[PDB]
Amino acid sequence: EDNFNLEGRIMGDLRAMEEEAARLNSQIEEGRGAKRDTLAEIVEAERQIM
């Protein structure tokens, strides 16, 4: 019984780690997209100043 409970809890902890990892990956992808579009905006700002 203890080994059954142990395996279940370990599998749960695993899926928890991939859950938080997926959250972090989504946030970093959002940040990269924001950075590149901000570079696009800075180029447009230079054009407007010109």
Binding site: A21, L24, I28, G31, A34, K35
Partner: peptide
């Protein structure tokens, strides 16, 4: 997985300050 997530977090914070 702890150290992997820590590396992801470090990348995250560097990206935030840059942006």
């Amino acid at each position: 997985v702890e150290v992997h997530r820590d590396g992801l977090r470090a990348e995250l914070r560097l990206l935030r300050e840059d942006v």
